[PDB]
Design a protein around this ligand. Structure first.
Ligand SMILES: NCCc1ccc(C(=O)CS)cc1
Ligand SMILES: [K+]
Ligand SMILES: [K+]
Ligand SMILES: [Zn+2]
Length: 613
């Protein structure tokens, strides 16, 4: 399939600026582009992306989302002087015009369309368009909120018309409500629009009642418009991740979009004077990462807001880092979302439950160690395997805690991989197929705890007990099994056939596994599979690489060429095949029991406001 990422930017879109004193628009400056691109150049990301040039959007492409009258009015602007431009701007709300802004807006829409074409033609895996002006506020016959034409709506309609796409997800993480996109697709079930935005009970711009959680779409599009209003400032990484886990991601994976477009407005980042939130730029990596399993990785990230130049550059760098497959940074201090965020999440889940049943409630990169004598054609970012010091450690382990040379070799390979992952910055993750799970798991966990790894997240697909202690606060164990277990220790999550199985797992993956894992913040993920996992494991791997900077060691008991290939492909960063577009009632009941059991210790599991004694 496709590889690489597209970076679409041109200095020309920095050649328009506010020409008069306007305190409402003083923030939207050309430097936003400059700084941004220079950030990517300083850290070396811009050089690693395929540079697709910009083009003008044609008149018909513009008429896809706007009316002929408004297009003509804007076409008149390059011929106006300063007084005429100021009058024309006064005709609209929170926007300014400039002799070059029509040109730059055509260039922004055209760069968006170039990104869409690059992604859909399999020329690149994904990409980002550093554009100006933004788009998500502009409407069919109006410029609005620094926006002239709606770039993301253009991209959606263009993909629909030219690629016969049936399902497109739009994610608006700009701090403002992209009401232009909502208006454009409120009756359209083919374009699922999610937006989060500062609202403060309708007191924050654009002060619209239909920006609230009760706007779910009209007519055939009911349930395909999801507004999440922040009614307080200061929202943190925890609020954003809880929004993703308990609102956006389950709906997105049930929806199974054929293309993901992001209104990447970074005014939701800390330091921005307009959004006034407390999210670190690193969160925008994970956001990006959490969406990449969707649509086989086909993601189009388009710039919107973001006005603190420093945090803007940092957040753009984080987004591009994730788009290229670089290891995501560990997020610490995560916990429960604030009460206001929990109220907003609860309200949006309640109102959307009549459309998405998951919301209803009751009243080198990778190293591979195949079996001895087995040789596979591994992807281009992989390698195979032992030192004499490794053998000394193995002999010490054997003489102190445990005759087969193959199992001793497997333990030595485990130790070598762990050393190359933790102590060395050479390898990132690894997969070892092994016999004797007990000895292998014991050696792996104990050696990782001395790597050192302050915390280890073990994920075991199988039954029975494993040689791992969840007593202290250094190990957390997720076990997906077939038998029942009361699950007493607050440091363990037990999860117990049919067609609904896959639909359950993803649910339990998004609503339970990922929140606890993110709050736990492990230094290493240890995967174990003992022998329908083929359907889900891939996603499970990719998403779980959001933890521990991708440092994951998978242990596979028994040779299955399909399972080994899928594990290595997901660990190496290849795109994930979509699952396609309802869990069992007993399954969701058991999931809710687990959540109510664990949410007191792991606050990121909360999706309702806690009741006070
Ligand atoms: N605050 C009132 C005026 C206003 C309007 C839009 C924005 C954006 O950032 C749009 S992405 C900022 C300010
Ligand atoms: K938004
Ligand atoms: K919609
Ligand atoms: Zn904005």
């Amino acid at each position: 399939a496709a590889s690489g990422s597209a970076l679409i930017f041109d200095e020309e879109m920095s050649r328009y600026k506010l020409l008069w004193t306007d305190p409402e628009c003083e923030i939207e400056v050309p430097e936003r582009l400059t700084v941004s691109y220079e950030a990517l150049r300083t850290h070396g990301l811009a050089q690693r992306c395929k540079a697709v040039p910009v083009r003008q959007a044609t008149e018909q492409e513009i008429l896809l989302a706007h009316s002929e009258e408004y297009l003509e009015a804007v076409k008149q602007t390059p011929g106006m002087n300063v007084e005429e431009l100021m009058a024309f701007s006064k005709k609209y709300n929170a926007v300014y015009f400039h002799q070059n802004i029509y040109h730059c807006a055509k260039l922004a829409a055209g760069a968006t369309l170039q990104l869409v074409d690059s992604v859909m033609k399999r020329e690149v895996r994904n990409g980002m368009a550093l554009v100006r002006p933004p788009g998500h506020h502009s409407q069919r016959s109006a410029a609005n909120g620094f926006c002239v034409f709606n770039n993301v709506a253009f991209a959606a309609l263009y993909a629909k018309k030219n690629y016969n796409l049936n399902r497109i997800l739009i994610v608006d993480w700009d701090v403002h409500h992209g009401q232009g996109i909502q208006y454009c697709f409120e009756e359209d079930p083919s374009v699922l629009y999610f937006s989060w935005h500062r609202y403060e009970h309708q007191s924050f711009w654009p002060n619209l009642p239909e920006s609230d959680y009760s706007s779910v779409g009209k007519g055939k599009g009911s349930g395909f418009n999801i507004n999440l209003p922040w009614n307080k400032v200061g929202m943190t990484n925890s609020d954003y991740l809880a929004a993703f886990f308990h609102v956006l991601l389950p709906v997105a994976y049930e929806f199974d979009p054929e293309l993901v477009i992001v209104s990447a407005g970074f005014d939701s980042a800390i330091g921005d004077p307009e959004g006034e939130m407390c999210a670190l730029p690193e969160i925008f990596a994970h956001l990006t990462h959490l969406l990449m399993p969707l649509a086989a990785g086909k993601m189009c990230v388009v710039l919107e807001g973001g006005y603190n130049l420093t945090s803007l550059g940092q957040s753009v760098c984080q987004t591009v880092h994730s788009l290229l497959g670089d290891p995501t940074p560990r997020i610490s201090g995560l916990g429960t979302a604030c009460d206001s965020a929990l109220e907003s999440i609860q309200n949006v889940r309640n109102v959307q439950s009549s459309y998405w049943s998951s919301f209803k409630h009751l009243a080198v990169r990778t190293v591979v160690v195949p079996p001895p004598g087995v040789e596979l054609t591994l992807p281009k970012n992989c390698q195979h395997s032992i030192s004499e010091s490794t053998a000394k450690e193995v002999q010490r382990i054997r003489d102190k805690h445990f005759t087969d040379q193959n199992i001793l070799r497997s333990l030595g390979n485990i130790i070598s991989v762990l050393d190359r992952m933790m102590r060395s910055d050479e390898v990132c993750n690894g997969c070892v197929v092994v016999s004797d799970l007990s000895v292998s798991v014991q050696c792996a966990l104990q050696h990782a705890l001395t790597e050192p790894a302050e915390r280890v997240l073990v994920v075991y697909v199988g039954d029975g007990e494993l040689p791992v202690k969840t007593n202290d606060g250094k190990v957390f164990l997720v076990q997906i099994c077939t038998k029942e277990t009361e699950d007493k220790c607050v440091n363990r999550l037990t999860l117990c056939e049919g067609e609904s199985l896959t639909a359950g797992f993803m649910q339990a993956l998004l609503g339970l596994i990922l929140p606890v894992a993110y709050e736990f913040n492990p230094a290493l993920v240890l995967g174990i599979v003992e022998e329908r996992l083929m359907r889900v494991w891939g996603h499970m791997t990719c998403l779980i690489q959001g933890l521990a900077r991708g440092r994951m060691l998978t242990l596979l008991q028994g040779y299955d060429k399909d399972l080994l290939e899928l594990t290595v492909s997901a660990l190496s960063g290849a795109s994930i095949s979509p699952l396609g577009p309802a869990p069992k009632p007993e399954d969701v009941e058991m999931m809710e029991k687990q959540r109510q059991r664990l949410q007191e210790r792991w606050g990121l599991l909360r999706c309702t406001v806690s009741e006070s004694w």
